[PDB]
Ligand binder design. Structure first.
Ligand SMILES: Nc1ccn([C@H]2C[C@H](O)[C@@H](COP(=O)(O)OP(=O)(O)OP(=O)(O)O)O2)c(=O)n1
Ligand SMILES: [Mg+2]
Ligand SMILES: [Mg+2]
Ligand SMILES: [Mg+2]
Length: 377
DNA sequence: GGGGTCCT
DNA sequence: AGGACCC
């Protein structure tokens, strides 16, 4: 059966939140700073040369009058992240999150109802909100076109609600699966929406240049295909299956080629509460158990705060180390789930993990350490 | 780089 | 426990 999915994408997320936080930035070109970088920035400041994920030095050299705020505390950001998700769940319960500023909702059932309450008379009255991709002419006699136009209206409603109620602007993409919804949502930015009719499905996939532009084909898989002389969507569309299956495995091969055609049958998953929490830290060198201890203490500190709130409790903790990652994990003892000291017993366990994984007696060098709580009940 | 999902 | 993807 034919679905109707909507993808929602918040214009420069962290950027938006900062302004909404300190109005005294609305007028001013702005970049959120993570360490030495500018990971996002408002559109006002995009005009002056700035680009996502750019070096802060080059930044000001590109825009002397560039404000800077710190988005190394992702705390303000995820409150909004979930306010957005909750706002949308009120529409349809099934809402899939992707990162902090992206949402998928399945509108198929909500659309059928709107129509199953639409007098056969006013059927021609149905119209579109936002852009129709490739300016493709509407065909109202084609039920599929009808179910998608409604789709656009709900999206327009959702985008207005986000704005009126949360003050956030965003883009929307309405198509027949998550893949196309995602791709069509960025055709018109910022703060605008685009819908995709099926007859223009092939135009959209071919508009893509590098093969790694399709959601799902990431770093590894690209280099795999780039090696095979596969660079375009048509290259991939036309490549031999069997050779791909041999080279990528039947699981991947089958899926990612379907993707080259714009076929995606994966469902909108309900995300609900966060399955896990974590804090990260990378760096040039770390050759001591003791300073590992210091880091491991900090991270532990930061986590205990969210892990605190939430509600439900974590029943497993893990340790991750980059020297290519590797991890260890074990249940947290029953008496530990109890909040009045909790630190020292934790670092004790963590160190135990950090020692069976590493040979301390000998020299060692990590560029990254993480701590993760999960298995929440 | 710095969170989080899922497949296996 | 590790590997891939997403942002
Ligand atoms: N590898 C990455 C990718 C992005 N981000 C951060 C910066 C963004 O604020 C947020 C989501 O990235 P997006 O691709 O969604 O960018 P925006 O929605 O912020 O920008 P745009 O206005 O161009 O859509 O996550 C990050 O830290 N690490
Ligand atoms: Mg995005
Ligand atoms: Mg966006
Ligand atoms: Mg990709």
């Amino acid at each position: 059966s034919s679905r109707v999915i909507v993808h929602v994408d918040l214009d420069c997320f962290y950027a938006q939140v900062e302004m909404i936080s300190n109005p005294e930035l609305k007028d001013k070109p702005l970049g959120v700073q993570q360490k030495y970088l500018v990971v996002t920035c408002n559109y006002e400041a995009r005009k002056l040369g700035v680009k996502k994920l750019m070096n802060v030095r080059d930044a000001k050299e590109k825009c002397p009058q560039l404000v800077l705020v710190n988005g190394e505390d992702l705390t303000r950001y995820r409150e909004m992240s979930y306010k957005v998700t909750e706002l949308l769940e009120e529409f349809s319960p099934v809402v899939e999150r992707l990162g902090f500023d992206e949402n998928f909702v399945d509108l198929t059932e909500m659309v059928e109802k709107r129509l199953q309450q639409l007098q056969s008379d006013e059927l021609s009255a149905v119209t579109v909100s936002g852009h129709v991709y490739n300016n493709q002419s509407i065909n109202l006699l084609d039920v599929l076109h009808i179910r998608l136009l409604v789709g656009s209206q709900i999206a327009a409603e959702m985008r207005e609600a986000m704005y009126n109620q949360l003050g956030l602007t965003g883009c929307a993409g309405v198509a027949s699966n998550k893949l196309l919804a995602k791709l069509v949502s960025g055709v018109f930015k910022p703060n605008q929406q685009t819908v995709l009719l099926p007859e223009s499905c092939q135009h959209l996939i071919h508009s893509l240049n590098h093969i790694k532009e399709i959601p799902g084909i990431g770093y590894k898989t690209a280099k795999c295909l780039e090696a095979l002389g596969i660079n375009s969507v048509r290259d991939l569309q036309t490549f031999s299956p069997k050779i791909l299956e041999k080279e990528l495995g039947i699981s991947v091969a089958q899926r990612i080629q379907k993707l080259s055609f714009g076929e995606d049958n994966s469902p909108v998953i309900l995300s609900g509460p966060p399955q896990s929490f974590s804090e990260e830290d990378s760096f040039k060198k770390c050759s001591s158990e003791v300073e590992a201890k210091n880091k491991i203490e900090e991270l532990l500190a930061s986590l205990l705060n969210r892990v605190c709130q939430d509600g439900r409790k974590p029943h497993t903790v893990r340790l991750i180390i980059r020297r290519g990652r590797e991890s260890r994990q074990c249940p947290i003892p029953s008496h530990v789930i109890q909040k009045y000291d909790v630190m020292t017993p934790m670092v004790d366990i963590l160190m135990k993990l950090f020692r069976n994984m590493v040979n301390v007696k000998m020299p060692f060098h990590l560029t990254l350490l993480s701590v993760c709580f999960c298995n929440l009940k």
